């Protein structure tokens, strides 16, 4: 299952525009984690600032307006904004990937307000220096020296921390190698503790198929959102084919279960992702289910 999905194109989905340090931080103060927003750079006019929520600890990634009409996020340059968002779908920024953007109207009740990167306290994990120098020279492994200052821009693991070098380059670095400045000490609960090492236990992927380099030509263009009341079209209900296996969940009470080769009868499709459809003796909501919208009634695209 994919955790990272969103759109990676919709300016009205992830672009938060007028926000700024205070607004950005409080809109991503924990929230649900794995949520991000690209606002207008309150630091430098013309640039942007991708703030990402993890550990109640919104890591701020600055995106530059390159004159060749490209974007450069913290030493790492890509071809465009939605391209870095796509790369971080498998990168894991802080300790998670870019699941989905934060709603542009993320009105919260209370409790989590502002809190400038608070995974524990105002001490540990943010400014660390390294003394042992491990110059791997990668974005996977930070080349740190024998007395540089690092910023733990990401802390996915307990034994490895992803800090930006004296250069500002993001890479993973060993804890027994470091030197954190204004910090108390390992107090157990005082150390954030994402978890005592993660682990996905599914023996079905003991020898899993690699992700594989395969750039697929996905049909792009312009936001297809017809707000028009739909004129003389004589269209009826919407039919979708379940092209991927879709079982329910432990917290499922309205999640439709579908599978490959089944035709989902959906009359009500909500713009929140979960459509209302009645299929095999059971009707409920489905997150598109992993289906594809088509028309099995006409001969034009009968195949």
UniProtKB/Swiss-Prot annotation:
**Alphabetic keyword roster:** Phosphoprotein, Repeat, SH2 domain, SH3 domain
Region feature (Disordered): 184-234
What are the residue boundaries of the SH2 domain, all occurrences included? 14-102
Against SMART domains, the record matches this protein to:
SH2, SH3
One Pfam family per UniProt: SH2
At what positions is Phosphotyrosine found? Answer: 127, 207
Report a single Gene Ontology molecular function: cadherin binding
Q: Does the keyword Repeat apply?
A: yes
| A Gene Ontology term for the protein's cellular component | neuromuscular junction
Organism domain of life: Eukaryota
Main role?
May mediate the transduction of intracellular signals.
Belongs to which family? Answer: Belongs to the CRK family.
Name assigned to this protein: Crk-like protein
Source species, please?
Homo sapiens (Human)
